[PDB]
């Protein structure tokens, strides 16, 4: 069906980013309008930066 | 509702090492950190550790000395104290670092919500 | 080091008292991830406030945060007996570890 969503991850970073640094995390699932998976870390600097999934640090993650 | 249970109060010579245990109730382990009471004294965070990031971190007065493990099979964080010393001798406490979770997304919180009873450490002396 | 609590602040009861909390540009005054605990003497600290001004549930809302520049406050509005506790404040830093205030004891009169 009709999507009137586009892929929002410009540019992507493994970076790991310590917890205590984060405000945000959201998991952007695959389709919609974007093919692949989107991660979006909402750090505490006010700087948004995109992770790619099956990163070794964000992998773990997706267990809860 | 979920509380930390840690292990007894031990009492331990000078030079040796205290290993200290703490226990979430339900079903995995979450960010845990660990903060020392000296008697009459305030609050001293020695470090933590977050397994869900696979990191653990300490104060500089506790490096080297201070060992911080988790195992999420049995969601038991642990407390190394090496080459105790007089000073040494107080109130060990865990403590989680809660995370919160929804549709909008995963919110990590930097603070202290729920505490464990307390490890009562005496040195000989 | 610590951060900067004074030792003690003595009030009347139903009056309000504000406990300050000062730190530097690499605690208090980074971000907002500054804590406040009540600690009756003996038992396990108790969260009040997270964030700068966020109470959990169950938390009286006569107790509020707030903060500017390296300098955080807790308000004790309508100051009550059961309030007779100690106070710490907390602080995550950009080392990415986490320093404790020196501790404030309250009194009642």
């Known amino acids: 069906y009709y999507t009137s969503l586009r892929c929002r991850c410009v540019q992507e970073s493994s970076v790991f980013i310590p917890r205590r640094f984060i405000d945000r995390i959201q998991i952007l699932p695959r389709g919609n309008g974007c093919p692949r998976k989107e991660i979006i870390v909402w750090k505490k600097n006010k700087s948004i930066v995109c992770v790619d999934p099956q990163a070794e640090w964000i992998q773990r993650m997706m267990e809860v | 509702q979920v509380q930390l249970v840690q292990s007894g109060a031990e009492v331990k010579k000078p030079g040796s090492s205290v290993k200290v245990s703490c226990k979430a109730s339900?079903?995995?382990?979450?960010?845990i950190s660990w903060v020392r009471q000296a008697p009459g004294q305030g609050l001293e965070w020695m470090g933590g550790?977050?397994?869900?990031?696979?990191?653990?971190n300490y104060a500089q007065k506790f490096q080297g000395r201070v060992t911080i493990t988790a195992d999420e099979s049995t969601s038991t964080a642990y407390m190394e104290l090496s080459s105790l010393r007089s000073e040494d001798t107080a109130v060990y406490y865990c403590?989680?670092?809660?995370?919160?979770?929804?549709?909008?997304?995963?919110?990590?919180?930097?603070?202290?919500?729920?505490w464990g009873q307390g490890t009562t450490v005496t040195v000989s002396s | 080091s610590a951060l900067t609590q004074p030792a003690s602040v003595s009030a009347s009861p139903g009056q309000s008292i504000t406990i300050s909390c000062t730190g530097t540009?690499?605690?208090?005054?980074?971000?907002?991830?500054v804590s406040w605990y009540q600690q009756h003497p003996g038992k396990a600290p108790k969260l009040l406030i997270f964030?700068?001004?966020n109470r959990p549930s169950g938390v009286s809302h006569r107790f509020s945060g707030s903060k500017s520049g390296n300098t955080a406050s807790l308000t004790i509005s309508g100051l009550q007996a059961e309030d007779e506790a100690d106070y710490y404040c907390?602080?995550?830093?950009?080392?990415?570890?986490?320093?404790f205030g020196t501790g404030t004891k309250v009194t009642v009169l």
């Open positions: 403590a989680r670092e809660p995370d919160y979770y929804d549709s909008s997304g995963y919110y990590p919180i930097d603070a202290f919500d729920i």
């Open positions: 339900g079903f995995s382990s979450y960010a």
């Open positions: 550790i977050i397994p869900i990031f696979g990191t653990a």
């Open positions: 540009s690499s605690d208090v005054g980074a971000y907002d991830w």
């Open positions: 964030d700068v001004n």
């Open positions: 907390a602080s995550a830093t950009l080392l990415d570890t986490y320093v």
